[PDB]
Design a protein around this ligand. Structure first.
Ligand SMILES: O=C(NO)[C@H](O)[C@H](O)COP(=O)(O)O
Ligand SMILES: O=C(NO)[C@H](O)[C@H](O)COP(=O)(O)O
Ligand SMILES: O=C(NO)[C@H](O)[C@H](O)COP(=O)(O)O
Ligand SMILES: O=C(NO)[C@H](O)[C@H](O)COP(=O)(O)O
Lengths: 151, 152, 151, 152
C-alpha cells in the first residue's frame, strides 16, 4: 500500500477527480488520499501545499501530488517542508528523472499550463518509476538534507 | 539602481554557462550577471551551487538567481531549502512570466537536457523583465510561504 | 479586418468558445470565424482541418486556428492544402517563430497536451507577431511552394 | 525485417546530427539510421532536406524519417507537402507516442532550439518503438488525409 496525498488550489479543483483517477491508474497499490478543497471557490495554494508536504515529511503517505495554476506555487511552498523533494514536472521525461535522479516524493503540475492527458502521464510515470539508488544521487539528496539542517 | 543576478550550474549546464551570462545581459543594461558555477568541465553536485546562489539571494547580495541543471529539478528543490528564496522551475515563456507575476519568484531554474537554449534565453529574459503584480491575494500567499519557513 | 477561421474535433469542442475569445483578445481587427463542430460528439479532424485550410488557401480568411487532441492530426491534414503553412505550437517561442521565420498562416494546438492559458498565449502571439520579411525565410517559403508544385 | 530511418537537418540541428543517428540505434537493433543532412556546418534551406527525407519515405525507400530544424516547424510543413507523408512535430514523450498510436506518423520533427537533447532522444525512441493502433476511427481519419492529397 502506497498512499499518495492530493492537494490543489481553485484552478485545479475542476480536475481533482482526474488526479484521484490517475493515482489509481498507476497500480492497485497506489491509494489516493484527497486533501484538496471541497468547493471551487478561491483558496491559497500554500495552505494545501503545506498539508500534503507535512503528511509526506511525517511519513503518513509515501507520495504527494499537488496542482495549481502553473505548479510553481506548489513546488516552492511544498519544498519549504524538511524531508520534501517536490518536483515541478511538465512532461514524461521530467517525471521519470525526478524519481530516478532526485528521488522526488511530491510531483507538482500546472492546470493552466499542462493538458490533462500529459498530467495523467506525469502522475503515472512519477509513481511507477523507481529511484536509481546510485551513489552520486544518494550523495546529492543527502546534501539537500544538509542545507535544511543548516537553517 | 542596477540589478545583480547570480548564476549557478552543475556539470551538464556548464557547456552553456556563457549563454546564461549572455541572456542575463540581453534583458537590459540594468542586469548584471554574476557567475558562480563550475569554472570548468568537472562533474559536480548541484546542491553546492544551488546553495551558493540561493544564499546570495536570501542575504540580498544579488536580487535574482539563475540556476541550471540537467532537468532543472534538483536546482529548484535545493534552492527552495534556503529561507527567503522562491525558486521557479520554468520550461517556457508562460511559466517564466507567471512565476514573477503571481509568485514573485527570485530564482529561475532550467534544465539543459530538457529545454533548448533559445527558450532558455526567452525564459531568462521574461523572468528578469516581468514585474510582480503586487496584488493582494499573491502578497498573502507569498506571506504564507514565509509563515511555513518560520514554522520549521 | 483580419479574419481567422476556427476548426476543431471533439476533444477541443469544450474549449471552442475559448478559442473564439482568444482571437478577439489579440486585437479588435482580429475577427474569429467559427467553422468547427456544433455538438460534442466524435468527428474526424481532417474534415475540419480541410475546411479551414481551404479558406486560408482561397484567401477567404488570413489565418487559421485548429485544435485537436495533440494538434498533430490538424497540422498534417492542414498542410496537405497548397498555400497552407500550418504550425503545431506548444509554447510562446514556437508561436512567435512560426510567424517570424516560417510565415505560418495556421496555428495548431493540442487540447489534451497544452493547458488553455498556454493555448491563449499561443493564439495571441501567433496573430500579433509579424513575419520578418528576411531574404532567407522568403527563399525557404518559396521552396515549400516549389515542393507543392512538383506534386 | 529491419527498419530504415532517414535523418535530415538544416544548420542549427547539424551540431547534434550524430546524436540523432545514435538515438535511432538506441530504439533497437532493428533500426538503421540513414544520414541525409548537411555533411557540414553550412547554413542551408530546411525544405531541401525535408524533401530529400520526405521523398525517401513516400517512395518507401525508408520506413521512417527524422527531421530536425530550429523549432521543428519548417521541417513539418515542408515534409507534409509530399504525398504519403505524415510528419509530426513532437516536443515531448506524449506527442511522440500519440503521433504513432493515432496518426500513424512516419516522420518525426524536432527543434534543436526548443527541445533539449535528452528529450529529443526520448521523442525519437518513443516514436520508433510505439506501434499504430490500427483502430477503425484512426484508419478512416488517415484515409481522409489521403483523400485531401488526392484532391490537389
Ligand atoms: O499558479 C499558482 N501558483 O503557482 C496559483 O494557482 C495561481 O496564482 C492562482 O491564480 P489566481 O488567484 O489568479 O487564480
Ligand atoms: O537533473 C539533475 N537534477 O535535477 C542533475 O543535473 C542530474 O542529477 C545530473 O545527473 P548526472 O549525474 O547523470 O549528470
Ligand atoms: O489528436 C488528434 N489528432 O492529432 C485527434 O484529435 C485524436 O486522435 C482524437 O482521438 P479520439 O478519437 O480517441 O478522441
Ligand atoms: O526554425 C526553423 N524552421 O522552422 C529553421 O531552422 C530556422 O528558420 C533557421 O533560422 P536561421 O536562418 O535564423 O538559422
Amino acid at each position: 500500500t502506497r498512499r499518495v496525498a492530493i492537494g490543489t488550489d481553485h484552478p485545479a479543483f475542476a480536475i481533482h477527480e482526474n488526479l484521484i483517477l490517475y493515482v489509481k491508474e498507476a497500480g492497485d497499490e497506489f491509494v489516493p488520499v484527497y486533501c484538496g478543497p471541497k468547493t471551487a471557490e478561491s483558496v491559497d495554494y500554500p495552505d494545501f501545499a503545506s498539508r500534503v508536504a507535512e503528511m509526506v515529511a511525517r511519513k503518513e503517505v509515501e507520495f504527494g501530488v499537488l496542482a495549481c495554476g502553473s505548479g510553481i506555487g506548489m513546488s516552492i511552498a511544498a519544498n519549504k517542508v524538511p524531508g520534501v523533494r517536490a518536483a515541478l514536472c511538465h512532461d514524461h521525461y521530467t517525471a521519470a528523472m525526478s524519481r530516478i535522479h532526485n528521488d522526488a516524493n511530491i510531483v507538482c503540475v500546472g492546470e493552466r499550463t499542462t493538458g490533462v492527458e500529459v498530467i495523467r502521464e506525469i502522475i503515472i510515470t512519477f509513481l511507477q518509476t523507481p529511484f536509481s539508488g546510485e551513489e552520486r544521487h544518494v550523495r546529492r539528496i543527502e546534501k539537500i538534507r544538509a542545507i535544511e539542517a543548516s537553517h
